[PDB]
Amino acid sequence: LYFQGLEEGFLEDSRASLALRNFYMNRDFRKSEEWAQGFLFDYRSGYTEGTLGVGLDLLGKLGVRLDYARLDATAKLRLSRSELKVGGLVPKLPTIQPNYGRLFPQVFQGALLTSGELSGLSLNLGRLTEVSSDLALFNRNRRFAGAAQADRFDLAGLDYRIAPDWTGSYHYGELEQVYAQHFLGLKGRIGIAADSLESDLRLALSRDTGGARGGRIDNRSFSGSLTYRLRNGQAFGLGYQRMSGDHGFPYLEGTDPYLVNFGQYNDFAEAGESSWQLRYDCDFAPLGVPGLSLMTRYFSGHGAKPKGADGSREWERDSDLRYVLQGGALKGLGLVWRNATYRSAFSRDIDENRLYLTYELPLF
């Protein structure tokens, strides 16, 4: 956390890995398909010597259908308990979260400063200018006037350790001339007593800003969860979510929305929409079968006020099965199967399968 810069570490502490990813996706409307192999070279330098240390990250991506090629560089500066990254960025913030269900998450260009000079307090500040063309408001079901674009997305935030099991966060995000969103969140855990109860509460307020290319937007979002997690590998979760104001929940193209009732397909984020989620996870590891996990969840939404369409109710069931080989030559191989059923009164019904074969190979 504190950066000493006592040794010349750029080359010496360098590490890298190659990720191999085979992804298949199947989609039935009311039909399409996608199959692809990805290669991902992920390099992370150490830091040059001195109180201000300099570093370099590199992301090399190759994608082939059934030819996509990209190289993203990131300069990193390190001083005291603060870090500045400039170049390719994969932010993980309440206002901007990667899309993970693909071959590769989007890379954003800009600068991001994080700082933990104060104990228990993290601060961040950032500005993004590009996505792997401009940053754009993700329309989806015509929730807004159009998919407005901008040159700049600003961000600032604070995450505070209130107590060892409690954290509160505030984050601000603004796609310039389109919308600004305020986020406030609280996460907590209590013991009961070999097991635990976790809570995750999220309020967000979004309004159009400046030229309002989106255009007029008013969204007040609540999204929260309660998870009962047992020591034997099981978890039971309850999620609840509500959209208030004249619009649905805005977020950028290329990102997943930071909402708890977000499934494999739907985000239950139409204007006016309330939704409930039940979720069950099971790890078969402390039961006998390590590497094998399973998840299922069901979401139900009502009170949606979709634009230009009639109907207000919708639901989704996702099931997820995963296995990772535990030994032999392929001791890293991961199989993931994500299946979904989505039914809506106001948008197109879908059935979908996603399949992932993953392997991670450390180079140095």
Coordinates of C-alpha atoms in Angstrom, one line a residue:
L1 CA 0.0 0.0 0.0
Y2 CA 2.7 2.5 0.9
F3 CA 5.2 2.7 -2.0
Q4 CA 8.9 2.7 -0.9
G5 CA 10.7 2.5 -4.3
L6 CA 13.8 1.3 -2.5
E7 CA 14.8 -1.1 -5.4
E8 CA 14.9 -1.0 -9.2
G9 CA 11.9 -3.2 -9.7
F10 CA 10.4 -2.6 -13.2
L11 CA 12.0 -5.6 -14.9
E12 CA 12.7 -7.7 -11.7
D13 CA 9.1 -7.7 -10.5
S14 CA 7.6 -8.0 -13.9
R15 CA 5.0 -10.7 -14.4
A16 CA 2.9 -11.9 -17.2
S17 CA 0.4 -14.6 -18.2
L18 CA -1.5 -15.8 -21.2
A19 CA -5.2 -16.5 -20.9
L20 CA -7.0 -18.8 -23.4
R21 CA -10.7 -18.5 -23.8
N22 CA -13.1 -20.4 -26.0
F23 CA -16.6 -18.8 -25.9
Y24 CA -19.8 -20.1 -27.5
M25 CA -23.1 -18.2 -27.4
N26 CA -26.6 -19.4 -28.5
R27 CA -29.7 -17.3 -28.7
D28 CA -33.3 -18.0 -29.4
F29 CA -35.7 -15.1 -30.1
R30 CA -39.5 -15.6 -29.4
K31 CA -32.1 -17.6 -33.7
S32 CA -28.4 -16.6 -33.8
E33 CA -25.0 -17.9 -32.8
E34 CA -21.4 -16.9 -31.9
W35 CA -18.2 -18.9 -31.5
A36 CA -14.7 -17.5 -30.9
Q37 CA -11.2 -18.1 -29.5
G38 CA -9.4 -15.5 -27.6
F39 CA -5.9 -15.1 -26.5
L40 CA -4.9 -12.6 -23.9
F41 CA -1.4 -11.5 -23.0
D42 CA -1.5 -9.7 -19.6
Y43 CA 1.8 -8.1 -18.6
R44 CA 2.4 -6.1 -15.4
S45 CA 5.8 -4.4 -14.8
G46 CA 7.2 -3.7 -11.4
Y47 CA 8.2 -0.1 -10.5
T48 CA 11.4 1.9 -11.2
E49 CA 13.4 3.0 -8.2
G50 CA 12.7 6.2 -6.3
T51 CA 10.0 7.7 -4.1
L52 CA 8.0 8.3 -7.3
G53 CA 7.9 4.9 -9.1
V54 CA 7.0 4.4 -12.8
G55 CA 5.5 1.3 -14.4
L56 CA 3.9 -0.2 -17.4
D57 CA 1.0 -2.6 -18.0
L58 CA 0.3 -4.2 -21.3
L59 CA -2.8 -6.0 -22.6
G60 CA -2.4 -8.0 -25.8
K61 CA -5.6 -9.4 -27.2
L62 CA -6.2 -11.7 -30.2
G63 CA -9.7 -12.8 -31.2
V64 CA -10.7 -15.1 -34.0
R65 CA -14.3 -16.0 -35.0
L66 CA -15.1 -19.7 -34.8
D67 CA -9.3 -11.6 -36.8
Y68 CA -9.4 -9.2 -33.8
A69 CA -6.1 -7.8 -32.6
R70 CA -5.4 -5.2 -30.0
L71 CA -2.6 -3.8 -27.8
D72 CA -3.4 -1.6 -24.8
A73 CA -0.7 0.1 -22.8
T74 CA -1.1 1.7 -19.4
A75 CA 1.5 3.9 -17.7
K76 CA 1.4 3.7 -13.9
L77 CA 2.8 6.1 -11.4
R78 CA 3.2 5.3 -7.7
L79 CA 3.9 7.8 -4.9
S80 CA 3.2 7.3 -1.1
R81 CA -0.2 5.5 -0.9
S82 CA -1.5 6.9 -4.2
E83 CA -1.4 5.6 -7.7
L84 CA -2.0 7.2 -11.1
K85 CA -2.8 5.1 -14.2
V86 CA -2.8 6.7 -17.7
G87 CA -3.8 4.9 -20.9
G88 CA -5.9 1.7 -21.1
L89 CA -8.2 1.3 -18.1
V90 CA -10.7 -1.3 -17.0
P91 CA -12.5 0.5 -14.2
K92 CA -14.5 -1.4 -11.6
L93 CA -16.7 1.3 -10.1
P94 CA -20.4 1.7 -9.1
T95 CA -20.7 4.1 -12.1
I96 CA -18.7 1.9 -14.5
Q97 CA -18.3 -1.9 -14.3
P98 CA -16.8 -4.2 -17.0
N99 CA -18.9 -6.6 -19.0
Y100 CA -17.5 -10.0 -18.1
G101 CA -19.8 -12.4 -20.0
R102 CA -17.9 -11.7 -23.3
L103 CA -14.6 -12.8 -24.8
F104 CA -12.9 -9.6 -23.5
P105 CA -14.0 -6.7 -21.3
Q106 CA -14.0 -3.2 -23.0
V107 CA -10.9 -1.1 -22.5
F108 CA -11.4 2.6 -21.8
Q109 CA -8.8 5.3 -22.4
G110 CA -8.1 8.0 -19.8
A111 CA -6.5 8.6 -16.4
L112 CA -7.5 7.3 -13.0
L113 CA -6.1 8.3 -9.7
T114 CA -6.6 6.3 -6.6
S115 CA -5.4 7.3 -3.2
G116 CA -5.3 5.8 0.3
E117 CA -3.3 8.4 2.2
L118 CA -5.9 8.3 4.9
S119 CA -6.3 5.1 6.9
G120 CA -9.6 3.3 6.1
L121 CA -10.3 5.8 3.3
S122 CA -9.9 5.3 -0.4
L123 CA -10.3 8.1 -2.8
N124 CA -10.5 8.0 -6.6
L125 CA -10.7 10.6 -9.4
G126 CA -10.8 9.9 -13.1
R127 CA -11.5 11.0 -16.6
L128 CA -12.2 8.7 -19.6
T129 CA -12.2 9.8 -23.3
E130 CA -12.6 6.6 -25.4
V131 CA -13.9 3.0 -25.6
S132 CA -12.5 0.0 -27.5
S133 CA -15.1 5.6 -30.6
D134 CA -16.8 7.8 -27.9
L135 CA -18.4 6.7 -24.7
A136 CA -22.1 6.4 -25.1
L137 CA -25.3 6.1 -23.1
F138 CA -26.6 2.5 -23.4
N139 CA -30.2 3.0 -24.6
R140 CA -31.8 -0.5 -24.4
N141 CA -35.5 -0.8 -25.0
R142 CA -35.5 3.0 -26.0
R143 CA -35.4 4.0 -22.3
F144 CA -33.9 7.4 -23.3
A145 CA -34.3 9.6 -26.3
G146 CA -31.2 8.2 -28.1
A147 CA -27.8 6.7 -27.3
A148 CA -26.1 10.0 -26.7
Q149 CA -22.3 10.2 -27.0
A150 CA -19.6 12.4 -25.3
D151 CA -15.9 13.1 -25.3
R152 CA -15.5 12.8 -21.6
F153 CA -16.7 10.8 -18.7
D154 CA -15.7 12.1 -15.3
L155 CA -15.5 10.2 -12.1
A156 CA -14.8 10.7 -8.4
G157 CA -15.4 8.6 -5.4
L158 CA -14.7 7.6 -1.8
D159 CA -14.9 4.3 0.0
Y160 CA -14.7 4.2 3.7
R161 CA -14.1 1.4 6.2
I162 CA -16.6 2.2 8.9
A163 CA -15.8 -0.9 10.9
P164 CA -14.2 -4.2 10.0
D165 CA -17.4 -5.7 8.6
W166 CA -18.9 -2.4 7.3
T167 CA -18.1 -0.2 4.3
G168 CA -19.8 2.9 2.9
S169 CA -19.2 4.4 -0.5
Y170 CA -20.0 7.5 -2.5
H171 CA -19.3 7.8 -6.2
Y172 CA -20.0 10.4 -8.9
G173 CA -20.0 9.8 -12.6
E174 CA -20.8 12.1 -15.5
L175 CA -21.0 11.4 -19.2
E176 CA -20.5 15.0 -20.2
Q177 CA -23.5 16.7 -21.9
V178 CA -25.6 13.6 -21.2
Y179 CA -26.1 12.5 -17.6
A180 CA -24.6 12.6 -14.1
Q181 CA -25.2 9.9 -11.6
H182 CA -24.7 10.0 -7.8
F183 CA -24.2 6.7 -6.0
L184 CA -24.4 5.8 -2.3
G185 CA -23.8 2.4 -1.0
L186 CA -23.4 0.3 2.2
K187 CA -22.1 -3.2 2.6
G188 CA -22.1 -5.1 5.9
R189 CA -21.5 -8.6 7.4
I190 CA -22.6 -10.1 10.7
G191 CA -21.7 -13.5 12.0
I192 CA -24.4 -16.2 12.8
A193 CA -22.2 -17.6 14.1
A194 CA -20.0 -20.0 12.1
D195 CA -22.0 -18.7 9.1
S196 CA -22.7 -15.1 8.0
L197 CA -25.4 -12.6 6.8
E198 CA -24.3 -10.1 4.2
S199 CA -26.1 -7.0 3.0
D200 CA -25.5 -4.7 0.1
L201 CA -27.5 -1.6 -0.3
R202 CA -27.4 0.8 -3.2
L203 CA -29.1 4.1 -3.9
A204 CA -28.4 6.1 -7.1
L205 CA -29.7 9.4 -8.5
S206 CA -29.3 10.2 -12.2
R207 CA -30.3 13.3 -14.1
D208 CA -29.5 14.7 -17.5
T209 CA -26.8 17.4 -17.6
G210 CA -25.6 20.2 -19.9
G211 CA -26.9 19.8 -23.5
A212 CA -28.8 16.7 -22.4
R213 CA -28.1 14.8 -25.6
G214 CA -30.0 11.8 -24.1
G215 CA -32.1 13.9 -23.4
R216 CA -34.1 14.6 -20.3
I217 CA -33.4 12.0 -17.6
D218 CA -34.7 11.5 -14.1
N219 CA -33.9 8.1 -12.5
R220 CA -33.8 7.2 -8.8
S221 CA -32.7 3.7 -8.2
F222 CA -32.7 1.4 -5.3
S223 CA -31.1 -2.0 -5.5
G224 CA -30.1 -4.2 -2.6
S225 CA -29.4 -7.7 -1.4
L226 CA -29.3 -9.9 1.6
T227 CA -27.2 -13.1 1.5
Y228 CA -27.2 -15.9 4.0
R229 CA -23.9 -17.8 3.5
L230 CA -23.3 -21.1 5.2
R231 CA -19.9 -22.6 6.1
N232 CA -20.7 -25.8 4.1
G233 CA -20.5 -24.0 0.7
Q234 CA -24.2 -22.9 0.3
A235 CA -25.6 -19.4 -0.1
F236 CA -29.2 -18.1 -0.2
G237 CA -29.8 -14.7 -1.5
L238 CA -32.7 -12.2 -1.7
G239 CA -32.5 -9.2 -3.9
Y240 CA -34.8 -6.3 -4.4
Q241 CA -34.8 -3.4 -6.8
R242 CA -36.9 -0.4 -7.7
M243 CA -36.7 2.3 -10.4
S244 CA -38.4 5.6 -9.6
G245 CA -38.7 8.8 -11.6
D246 CA -39.6 9.2 -15.3
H247 CA -36.7 7.0 -16.6
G248 CA -34.8 3.8 -16.2
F249 CA -31.3 3.3 -15.0
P250 CA -28.5 4.8 -17.2
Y251 CA -25.1 3.3 -17.7
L252 CA -22.4 3.3 -20.4
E253 CA -22.3 1.1 -23.5
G254 CA -19.8 -1.7 -23.0
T255 CA -20.5 -1.9 -19.2
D256 CA -22.7 -4.0 -16.9
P257 CA -25.0 -1.8 -14.7
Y258 CA -24.1 -1.9 -11.0
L259 CA -27.4 -3.4 -10.0
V260 CA -28.2 -6.4 -7.8
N261 CA -31.1 -7.6 -9.9
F262 CA -29.0 -7.9 -13.1
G263 CA -29.2 -11.3 -14.7
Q264 CA -27.5 -13.0 -17.7
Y265 CA -29.8 -11.1 -20.0
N266 CA -32.1 -8.5 -18.3
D267 CA -31.3 -5.7 -15.9
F268 CA -34.8 -5.0 -14.7
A269 CA -34.2 -1.3 -15.0
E270 CA -37.2 0.0 -17.0
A271 CA -38.7 3.3 -15.6
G272 CA -41.0 2.5 -12.7
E273 CA -40.0 -1.2 -12.4
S274 CA -39.8 -3.1 -9.1
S275 CA -38.2 -6.5 -9.0
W276 CA -37.4 -9.4 -6.6
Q277 CA -34.7 -12.0 -6.8
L278 CA -34.1 -15.3 -5.2
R279 CA -30.7 -16.9 -5.6
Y280 CA -29.0 -20.2 -4.5
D281 CA -25.3 -21.0 -4.8
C282 CA -23.6 -24.3 -4.0
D283 CA -19.9 -25.2 -3.8
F284 CA -19.4 -28.9 -4.0
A285 CA -15.9 -28.6 -2.6
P286 CA -16.3 -29.0 1.1
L287 CA -18.9 -31.7 0.2
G288 CA -16.5 -33.8 -1.9
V289 CA -16.2 -32.4 -5.4
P290 CA -13.8 -29.4 -5.5
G291 CA -13.9 -27.4 -8.6
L292 CA -17.7 -28.0 -9.1
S293 CA -20.0 -25.1 -8.3
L294 CA -23.6 -24.3 -9.2
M295 CA -25.8 -21.2 -9.1
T296 CA -29.5 -20.6 -9.9
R297 CA -31.5 -17.4 -9.6
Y298 CA -34.9 -16.1 -10.4
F299 CA -36.0 -12.5 -10.9
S300 CA -39.5 -11.2 -11.2
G301 CA -40.4 -7.6 -12.3
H302 CA -43.6 -5.5 -12.3
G303 CA -44.7 -1.9 -12.6
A304 CA -42.4 -1.3 -15.6
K305 CA -43.2 1.7 -17.8
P306 CA -41.4 0.8 -21.0
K307 CA -41.4 3.3 -23.8
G308 CA -43.6 2.7 -26.9
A309 CA -44.6 -0.7 -25.8
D310 CA -47.5 -2.2 -23.7
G311 CA -47.0 -4.4 -20.7
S312 CA -45.3 -4.0 -17.3
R313 CA -44.2 -7.5 -16.2
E314 CA -41.2 -9.7 -17.0
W315 CA -39.1 -12.4 -15.4
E316 CA -35.8 -14.3 -15.9
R317 CA -34.3 -17.6 -14.6
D318 CA -30.6 -18.1 -14.9
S319 CA -28.7 -21.3 -14.1
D320 CA -24.9 -21.5 -14.0
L321 CA -22.8 -24.7 -13.8
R322 CA -19.0 -24.6 -13.5
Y323 CA -16.2 -27.1 -13.2
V324 CA -12.4 -26.7 -13.0
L325 CA -10.2 -29.7 -13.4
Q326 CA -8.3 -30.3 -10.2
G327 CA -5.4 -32.4 -11.4
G328 CA -3.6 -34.0 -14.4
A329 CA -2.1 -32.1 -17.4
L330 CA -5.2 -29.8 -17.7
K331 CA -5.2 -28.9 -14.0
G332 CA -6.3 -25.4 -14.9
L333 CA -9.1 -26.0 -17.4
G334 CA -12.4 -24.3 -16.6
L335 CA -15.8 -25.1 -18.1
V336 CA -18.6 -22.7 -17.5
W337 CA -22.2 -23.1 -18.7
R338 CA -24.6 -20.1 -18.3
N339 CA -28.2 -20.7 -19.3
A340 CA -31.1 -18.2 -19.3
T341 CA -34.8 -17.9 -19.9
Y342 CA -36.2 -14.4 -20.3
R343 CA -39.9 -13.6 -20.7
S344 CA -41.3 -10.0 -21.0
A345 CA -44.6 -8.4 -21.7
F346 CA -43.0 -5.4 -23.4
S347 CA -39.8 -6.7 -25.0
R348 CA -38.7 -9.7 -27.0
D349 CA -38.6 -13.0 -25.1
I350 CA -35.3 -14.9 -25.2
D351 CA -33.6 -18.2 -24.4
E352 CA -29.8 -18.2 -24.2
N353 CA -26.8 -20.3 -23.6
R354 CA -23.2 -19.2 -23.0
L355 CA -20.3 -21.6 -22.8
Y356 CA -16.8 -20.8 -21.7
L357 CA -13.7 -22.9 -21.8
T358 CA -10.9 -21.1 -20.0
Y359 CA -7.2 -21.7 -19.3
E360 CA -4.7 -19.4 -17.6
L361 CA -1.0 -19.9 -18.3
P362 CA 1.6 -18.0 -16.3
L363 CA 4.6 -17.0 -18.4
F364 CA 6.9 -15.3 -15.8

